Amino acid sequence: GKIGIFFGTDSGNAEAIAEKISKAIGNAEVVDVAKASKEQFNGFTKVILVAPTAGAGDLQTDWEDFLGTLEASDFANKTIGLVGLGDQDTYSETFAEGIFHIYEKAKAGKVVGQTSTDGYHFAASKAVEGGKFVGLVIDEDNQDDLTDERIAKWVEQVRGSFA
Numbered sequence: 001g002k003i004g005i006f007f008g009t010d011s012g013n014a015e016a017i018a019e020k021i022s023k024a025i026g027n028a029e030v031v032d033v034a035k036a037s038k039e040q041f042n043g044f045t046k047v048i049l050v051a052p053t054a055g056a057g058d059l060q061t062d063w064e065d066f067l068g069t070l071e072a073s074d075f076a077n078k079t080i081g082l083v084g085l086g087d088q089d090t091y092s093e094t095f096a097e098g099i100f101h102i103y104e105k106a107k108a109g110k111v112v113g114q115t116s117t118d119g120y121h122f123a124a125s126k127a128v129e130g131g132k133f134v135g136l137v138i139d140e141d142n143q144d145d146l147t148d149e150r151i152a153k154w155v156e157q158v159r160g161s162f163a
């Protein structure tokens with residue numbers, strides 16, 4: 001209920017991921033950003049932002065438009081978790097960068113869930129700050145076989161940060 005998990009998708013991967021996190025974290029509400037509003041968004045104090053990476057490393061359409069109506073002040077009082085989707089093989093130099101764009105404003109609040117870069121193969125990605133991943137990264141086009149465990153470990157790590 002209280003944990004707002006906002007996602008945006010084109011194919012459906014993100015939606016499916018958001019759903020898997022909800023079940024694994026519990027006490028959560030999945031919300032498609034394409035229908036979300038600023039008012040609804042601020043109704044939560046804890047949020048998990050799952051966003052797929054569009055061409056060039058930019059945000060999926062739904063997300064870019066929703067994010068544009070948000071300022072840093074809106075993230076200030078929240079605890080935030082970022083989950084990005086990407087294709088590390090086809091896009092070695094833009095791997096899951098969408099998240100980074102959300103990060104530009106989300107850094108105003110309390111961000112948690114930074115992940116190690118071990119187990120990935122790519123060239124560049126703004127999503128990496130301090131030799132670490134700004135949040136959880138998922139690859140459904142190349143590493144679908146590692147998702148279920150990654151979400152599990154992530155939920156474990158960040159679990160305590162949410163309540």
Ligand SMILES: Cc1cc2nc3c(=O)[nH]c(=O)nc-3n(C[C@H](O)[C@H](O)[C@H](O)COP(=O)(O)O)c2cc1C
Nearest residue numbers: 009010011012013014052053054055057086087096
């Ligand atoms: C037009 C297009 C552009 C993409 N650009 C990138 C990119 O720049 N970096 C990346 O890591 N993945 C990129 N991808 C792969 C997606 O991030 C990945 O497949 C994701 O799972 C898509 O999520 P969705 O099914 O929820 O829309 C792109 C996919 C498409 C169709």
